C-alpha cells in the first residue's frame, strides 16, 4: 500500500552480481581442483583482510580462494556422493566460519612455516579485548594522539573535528587548531579511549583508526589439508578446538 521508504537508486556503474557470479565461482574452484596437489584451509576470525592481497603476491605459485563459504562448500561437495575427489567432503565439514581455501603444489611443511612466521600489526576490529590503555593528552590533539612524541607529530586536520566530536571526544578548535581543552594546555583532563581488558566496541575502534594506532595482530590460522594422492585429511592444530560443522 503506502507509507513506505523510497529506495535510493544509485546512478553508478557497478551493479548487482547475482546468479552469474555464483556459477563463475563454482566454475573456477572446480577447474582448479584437479590442477593442484594439496588443498589447504585457513581462518581469519575477527581481523581486517586487507593484507590478503599481500599473500597473493608473495605466494604467486599457489591458488587461494576466499568467498562465500557455503558456495565453497557446495563447490567442493558437501556430501560424499557429490564431490570432485575423495576426501573433499571432509573439507566441507571443516568450512564453518570466515574461512578460505588454498591450493598449493609445494611442500606442506614450507607453507605453515611461512604462516607461523607471518606477523603484521593491524588495527583492532570491534569485539577484541584492548591490550593497552591508550589516551590522548589533555592539550592540543595531534595526528597520532600522543603515540609518537609531540615534537615529531603533526597536528590533526580540522575536518576531523566533526568526526572526533561525533565519535565521542569533547574536542574544540581555537584559532584553527583542534584542541581538547585549552590551546596552551592543562584546563581539561584528557580522553581515555580504551581501557585494559575492555572489549573494544565500534566507536573506539574508529578512534584508533583515525589516530593511526594499531592494537591488534594479523595472523592467519591454518586449519588442515587434504592431499590429492593420499585422499584423506589431517587436522593441523586449529580445528582441534575451533567449532566445526
Amino acid at each position: 500500500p503506502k507509507s513506505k521508504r523510497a529506495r535510493v537508486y544509485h546512478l553508478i556503474q557497478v551493479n548487482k552480481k547475482g546468479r552469474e557470479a555464483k556459477e563463475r565461482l563454482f566454475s573456477n574452484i572446480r577447474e582448479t581442483i584437479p590442477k593442484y596437489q594439496h588443498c589447504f584451509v585457513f581462518s581469519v576470525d575477527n581481523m581486517r583482510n586487507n593484507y590478503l592481497k599481500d599473500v597473493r603476491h608473495e605466494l604467486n605459485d599457489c591458488r587461494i580462494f576466499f568467498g562465500k563459504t557455503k558456495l565453497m562448500a557446495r563447490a567442493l561437495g558437501t556430501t560424499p556422493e557429490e564431490e570432485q575427489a575423495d576426501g573433499l567432503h571432509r573439507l566441507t565439514r571443516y568450512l564453518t566460519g570466515t574461512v578460505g581455501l588454498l591450493f598449493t603444489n609445494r611442500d606442506p611443511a614450507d607453507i605453515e612455516s611461512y604462516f607461523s612466521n607471518l606477523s603484521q600489526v593491524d588495527f583492532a576490529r570491534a569485539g577484541t579485548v584492548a591490550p593497552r590503555t591508550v589516551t590522548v593528552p589533555t592539550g592540543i590533539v595531534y595526528s597520532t594522539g600522543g603515540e609518537v612524541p609531540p615534537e615529531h607529530d603533526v597536528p590533526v586536520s580540522h575536518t576531523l573535528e566533526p568526526e572526533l566530536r561525533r565519535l565521542g571526544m569533547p574536542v574544540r578548535m581555537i584559532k584553527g587548531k583542534v584542541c581538547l581543552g585549552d590551546e596552551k594546555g592543562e584546563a581539561s583532563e584528557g580522553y581515555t579511549i580504551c581501557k585494559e581488558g575492555e572489549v573494544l566496541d565500534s566507536r573506539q575502534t574508529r578512534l584508533l583508526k583515525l589516530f593511526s594506532i594499531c592494537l591488534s595482530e594479523f595472523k592467519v590460522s591454518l586449519l588442515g589439508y587434504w592431499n590429492s594422492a593420499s585422499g584423506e585429511v589431517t587436522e593441523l592444530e586449529a580445528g582441534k578446538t575451533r567449532p566445526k560443522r
Binding site: 569533547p170 574544540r172 581539561s188 583532563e189
Partner: protein
Amino acid sequence: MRYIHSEETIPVPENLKVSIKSRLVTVEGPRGKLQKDLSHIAVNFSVVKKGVIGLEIHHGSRKDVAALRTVRTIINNMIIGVTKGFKYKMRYVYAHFPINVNVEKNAETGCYEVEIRNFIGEKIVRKVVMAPGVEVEISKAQKDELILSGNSLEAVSQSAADIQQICKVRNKDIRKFLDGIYVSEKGNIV
C-alpha cells in the same frame, strides 16, 4: 487484513519487580520508581516464562500490531532506566562572552533549576526548570559541560531539549554566531 494473533516479548532481569494493574505498568528496581499508564492502547499483558512479559493483540489491524512494537520499547526503556539509568552530557561553547551556568536544587517541589547568564552578553537571566526526577551537575572532568542524570528517559531528554531551545540565537546569522548549549553525549550512567 485483521490479523488473528500477534505477540511480543519483554525480558525482565533478575533485580527488577514489574507490576501491571490494568495498563498502569510500574517497574521497581535498584535505581528507584518508574510508572506509566498505557490505557490508550488495547494490549493483553501476560507472563509466559520466568522473566518474560508477554504482550498480545487479538483480531487487530496493521496499526494494532504496530502499536505493540512501540509499547515494547517504552516498557523496556523503563527497565533500562531503573537498572542502568540515563545520562545526557551537554556542552556549552562560546566565542567572546563566557556563558555562566548555576544549578540549585529548590527546597519545595524538589526540582533542580538551571539558570544561565551572559549568553552573547544579554542581561536577561534564563531560568529553566528540570522535570521531577532528573539531576543536573556541573562536570568537573571536562570544561564547560553539564551532566543530566535520571531514570526516566523522557524526563532527561525533555530537560536537555529545554536547555537547548532557551539559549537559541535570534535575528542573527547562525553561520557566524555559534554560541549555545548542545547535547554531546547520550547514553547510560553505568
